[PDB]
């Protein structure tokens with residue numbers, strides 16, 4: 001439970017691939 | 033009603049100021065931000081910060097349900 | 107070249123005349139308690155004088171090493187600006203604050219944010235939203251229980 | 258000293274005048290001795306209350322009549338010695354310069370913290386103990402700020418709910434500790450404490466461990482740092498929101514102190 005919570009962000013970054021799409025993803029998460 | 037937000041237009045380098053917050057958490061930016069690169073201790077700092085907080089939450093859960101069942105007897 | 111009164115402790119005594127600034131200090135009114143009759147041999151640059159010749163009185167290199175210094179200590183980040191002024195501060199006697207004595211290019215500034223701060227903010231705000239809706243649901247349930255009990 | 262009938266030099270406005278001491282007054286006995294025998298004040302005799310609590314002398318100005326005779330305390334009276342005679346000459350020269358300036362002018366004419374009262378009271382009593390008294394804090398200063406910040410975290414974080422807010426709590430604790438260490442030698446020192454700090458730094462070099470002011474000093478110098486913090490922050494360029502965060506952490510740390518002031522601030 002805890003491990004997935006702390007590991008969610010960089011595994012999402014790994015799934016995103018390109019760093020520009022991850023930059024826009026972090027922009028989305030900031031705008032929220 | 034509603035609220036609208038529009039991102040700021042791009043400004044040439046002679047009139048555009050990029051500033052770095054001193055406050056890391058909860059800095060109300062207008063939604064207009066820039067991502068800087070992230071430079072091992074920070075990784076474990078995040079791990080304990082979730083532990084503690086979730087623990088406190090459990091405690092917040094456990095402090096209010098006891099008042100609920102102690103209200104039904106009255 | 108000298109001052110009649112100590113600019114740190116605000117009484118007259120044994121002084122050390124600085125080269126550029128006319129302010130002088132006692133043998134203890136310094137960050138370090140300079141041992142009298144044992145003062146290092148040299149020009150006697152003070153903290154202000156060492157701050158000016160460290161930066162070579164130019165703004166660009168001083169802002170760049172200030173940003174480098176803030177980059178080093180992100181654990182004390184909100185105080186990191188306040189750690190810098192200290193270097194350019196000539197230690198002085200603790201004078202009480204006044205209230206203690208009693209009884210446009212800046213509008214479109216782009217925020218430079220990092221990934222970890224976005225992660226912390228997203229987690230903070232989702233936890234806030236989830237538990238305020240949970241606690242308001244609990245409060246409405248308790249209020250409805252009290253209403254059904256009273257009726 | 259002062260004797261009955263002896264010479265004295267006294268204030269009168271800004272200048273010094275010679276006088277005879279005809280009576281010597283004692284405030285404790287409500288009595289004075291005179292020259293042609295203790296006696297109290299008469300029916301028409303009185304002394305101004307500004308000096309009557311101090312030892313008074315009824316004096317008569319030389320070269321001036323008995324209408325100028327008056328009671329003077331130690332503020333207005335001095336013994337007739339060469340130091341007083343010399344400063345009498347000096348003030349005579351000042352009056353001469355004033356007369357010369359009179360001559361010159363006439364000849365030109367012919368041509369966001371709101372802390373409660375208990376922290377203020379304990380801070381001003383520490384001020385009285387550190388300025389009007391030689392007494393300073395104890396060496397190890399007992400409970401260090403280590404303890405305060407540490408437990409303060411252990412209570413507030415278990416009261417704080419978000420992981421984000423606990424990050425700001427730990428961040429503020431670490432920054433306050435490092436600022437205490439790096440600023441105690443810069444502002445957080447008074448008289449008869451510079452020597453104590455010198456003794457501390459010479460003691461630290463003996464056992465090869467580097468010096469540190471967090472554990473060494475007590476929690477009251479930490480409160481001194483919080484007291485100087487509002488004026489200190491606004492000196493340089495600082496944000497709006499970062500400033501508000503800092504005073505908010507300031508205020509809830511102060512009210513957490515206000516929960517148990519008596520733990521760290523009892524004499």
Ligand SMILES: [Zn+2]
Nearest residue numbers: 112115132135
């Ligand atoms: Zn001094």
Ligand SMILES: [Zn+2]
Nearest residue numbers: 124127152155
């Ligand atoms: Zn200097």
